[PDB]
Amino acid sequence: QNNVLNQIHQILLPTNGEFIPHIFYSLHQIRKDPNNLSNQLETLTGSIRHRLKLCKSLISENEDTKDLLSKSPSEWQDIIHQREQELQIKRDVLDDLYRKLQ
């Protein structure tokens, strides 16, 4: 199990409010009071925004995810299908020798 993808996956979707329930809860608490300095939505949504910077830091620091997320799924399937063929040709260049010793 690859690590950095896992703490990404439970750092943007913890096991709840994903990104938008927090922001509409914030603009819902604005509805009680629109006339105060401490009613900036940026203050409490910065926690979600700090989570966004955490996501940026975790995807930038790791380089295997940098190639993991850069290729299309059909590309991944065709490159694993052309990576099984050299292990297959190694299997047959050992089994023909196995035949030749018999």
Partner 1 sequence: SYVETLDSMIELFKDYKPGSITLENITRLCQTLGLESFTEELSNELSRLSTASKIIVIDVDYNKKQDRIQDVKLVLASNFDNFDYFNQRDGEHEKSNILLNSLTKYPDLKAFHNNLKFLYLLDAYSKLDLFKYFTELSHYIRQCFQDNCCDFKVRTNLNDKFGIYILTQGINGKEVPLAKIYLEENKSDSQYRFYEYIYSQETKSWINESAENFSNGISLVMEIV
Partner 2 sequence: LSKVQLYEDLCRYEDTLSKLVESVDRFKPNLDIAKDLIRTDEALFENVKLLAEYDNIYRNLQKIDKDSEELDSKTRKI
Partner 3 sequence: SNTLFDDIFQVSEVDPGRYNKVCRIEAASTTQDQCKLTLDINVELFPVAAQDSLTVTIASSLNLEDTPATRSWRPPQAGDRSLADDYDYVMYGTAYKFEEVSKDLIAVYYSFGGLLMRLEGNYRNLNNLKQENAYLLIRR
Which residues contribute to the site for partner 3 (CB under 8 A)? 34-38
Q: Which helix (H) or strand (E) holds 22?
A: helix 20-32
Amino acid identity, position 57: S
Span near partner 1 by CB under 8 A; candidates 4-12, 16-24, 42-50, 93-101: 16-24
Using rule CB under 8 A, residue 83 touches partner 2 = yes
Using rule CB under 8 A, residue 45 touches partner 2 = yes
* Nearest by Cα to 23 from 50, 55, 45, 51: 45
Our CB check for partner 1 shows the closer of 14 and 46 to be: 14
- Residue 49 CB: number of other CB atoms within 10 A? 12
* DSSP assignment string, 51-101: HHHHHHHHHHH-SHHHHHSSS-HHHHHHHHHTTHHHHHHHHHHHHHHHHHT
Least distance from partner 1 to the Cβ atom of residue 14, Å: 11
Q: What residues line the site for partner 2 (CB under 8 A)?
A: 1-2, 5, 9, 12-13, 20, 23, 27, 40-42, 45, 49, 52, 55-56, 59-60, 66, 68-70, 73, 76-77, 80, 83-84, 86-87, 90, 94
